[PDB]
């Protein structure tokens, strides 16, 4: 039926309106033409769309033995979001675990290609140094 | 009838609280919470169940030198015994690493022939490094 | 009523497929297979598992420097939320050493009260490392 | 109806024997115990159970050269085949460290289609070395 | 009801005796003013209390990759009891898990504190020594 | 009842005749004296005997983190059989899974047992050199 309307539960045909963002279906409209209820998550949860979810979700903890630091706070339709302090890349293990790791500075080198959001540093030695794997070690 | 399935609360950053009130937690048919135990609401098997996920990261040598014991495990008091008894446990030992993070998962369950009133509480051992998430951290239980 | 019981399909070496036409797999009360996922029949409570085995041999010292992300969890697919949402997840990080082989192994199960079309799936991270066979990476449902 | 909880017996040190009369184990309408096999009464649906846990020290730099292969599963003897056929496999390896004791934890579950007359029984690979008690070494089955 | 009785499954107000240590209920007592059938622990089995339990718990072996040994050999009322052999001490990992460590002996030292049950010795070295975590080595 | 013959479920004295390697009970025979319905496992599966299985096996891959190989390709009767490429040798783990190493060479000595299915080759090192596990090292 509507997109933006799920079908009740004990009554087909009788389109309910969907929970918007930040709240969640508490109970099914009563019917056709009657508000679904729909009620706030309590601190800690958060739903971030069209639902008819009986609960809403937690909100994430950042992954601390990945070296994240939490960017945004959690709100009742916005999930924490984590990240890393600026001066470090990201590593991605999956999709979804990345960890934290500080960006080379060049010691005995000069930067050839400066840090980004998923890459190290590049450098390029002195002459006189290896490059071996991101860092320059004397000959 | 009765059952329930319950996530760490990932809010509580220093101890381990069970709680029924968001993502696909519950509770049906007699189960309840009280002082972060389950509740058995009549005798009868029961099939009971945990999960526990912990992960770290030496940042010292220091850390590197002594291992760490990880545990958790699901205990009973019933009114047969004046004593909290273990029906699961799951042990590990970890051995970090200068810098190299660490990530472990235990899982645990099994069937008990349990008495209404009994009360059925986890223990664990390495609280400061769950992963708490409501897919990595749960304890729940069903009665067959 | 309602029951499956999956196995990783052992002839396909870079997907992880499962299949209920050999060893001891099945489905039965309308349970049924669709893009690799268990449609649920029926509203009610579930108990969903799973297991997987993962194994290595590091050949080059380059690939003994950094380690292995293991993971896998199941999903759910609800008309309730236009996302997928993770039910369980065990992960794992494996050191590998110059030339031993390593083997692991990550089980997992809960309850959880379920809506009739519901698409249950699972996601792995370390799919060509998996140890196929029927005893080894399985997958299943049934309801209380 | 069916179901049955045991405990691997520890006052056996060398071999694996499961027994039911302690603790929280238990047998009912059915299940019983010959040659250490579990036989199912009845055919149907069964959710079938194991955990076992190792630990060990090695003492000598001899030990610590070669890896160990610890392995827990549980298999089947029905008529329908003359061969024991594994249901669930777990397998680990582990590199002991010179005095440094190590602690592992296996657990697997899943839900088949048995036949009256079908024996379950389990087979290890590193007796020697399992943490005996009530809570950690167990194995079980239920009838859905 | 009384402590010391316990209230019967199928019937309100009949509270039985309870078993007492090294015994199990094996049959609930029959009615008011009669004995509850309790039985006596198989060996390798213990209760250590005032109880209604249906079966006796099985006796602790010690961890022997904790280097554990029995002090006290299991009873039908009392369970092992494990230790470490004396010039040992205790560390404990959790509240019940303890592993066995052989006692410093200040070679190269001065015992200033001696080993205690649940702690190593604290050595004290001889001038030209460095204490090194509880060994003394030569600068 | 006879063996090659099996027990009907539904009705106790109708004694089917049993499935032969490469085919599966699709149905149990109708009557006395009336064929078991058996059919051809798909490429993939097998049976290697009397059977009155619903399903087939699936055929086994072999252990390639243990270096094995495939000898033998599986068929509807055959099981895969996997080993090692000659001049390694087979390491049993357990009674099932076994690692596949090379053979030694005996440099710097004379081959003393040649290598074998399931033991390595024996050295003997010539003067000058020690034997250390398996390979001889200058003194």
Request: net charge neutral; hydrophobic share 30%.
């Amino acid at each position: 039926c509507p997109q933006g309307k799920y079908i009740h539960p004990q009554n087909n045909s009788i389109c309910c309106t969907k929970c918007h963002k930040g709240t969640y279906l508490y109970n099914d409209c009563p019917g056709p033409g009657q508000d679904t209820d729909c009620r706030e998550c309590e601190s800690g949860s958060f739903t971030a769309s069209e639902n008819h979810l009986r609960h809403c979700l937690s909100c994430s903890k950042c992954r601390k033995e990945m070296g994240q630091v939490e960017i945004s706070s959690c709100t009742v339709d916005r999930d924490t979001v984590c990240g890393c302090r600026k001066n470090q890349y990201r590593h991605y293990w999956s999709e979804n675990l990345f960890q934290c790791f500080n960006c080379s500075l060049c010691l005995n080198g000069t930067v050839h290609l400066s840090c980004q959001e998923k890459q190290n540093t590049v450098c390029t030695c002195h002459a006189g140094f290896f490059l071996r794997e991101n860092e320059c070690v004397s000959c | 009838k009765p059952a329930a399935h319950l996530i760490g609360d990932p809010s509580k950053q220093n101890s381990l609280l069970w709680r029924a009130n968001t993502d696909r937690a519950f509770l049906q048919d007699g189960f309840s919470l009280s002082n972060n135990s389950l509740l058995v609401p009549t005798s009868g098997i029961y099939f009971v169940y945990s999960q526990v996920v912990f992960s770290g990261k030496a940042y010292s040598p220091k850390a590197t030198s002594s291992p760490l014991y990880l545990a958790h495990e699901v205990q009973l008091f019933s009114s047969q015994y004046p004593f909290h008894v273990p029906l699961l446990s799951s042990q590990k030992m970890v051995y970090p690493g200068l810098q190299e993070p660490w990530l472990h998962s235990m899982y645990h369950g099994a069937a008990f022939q349990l008495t209404q009133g009994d009360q059925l509480s986890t223990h664990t051992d390495g609280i400061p490094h769950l992963v708490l998430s409501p897919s990595t951290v749960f304890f729940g239980a069903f009665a067959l």
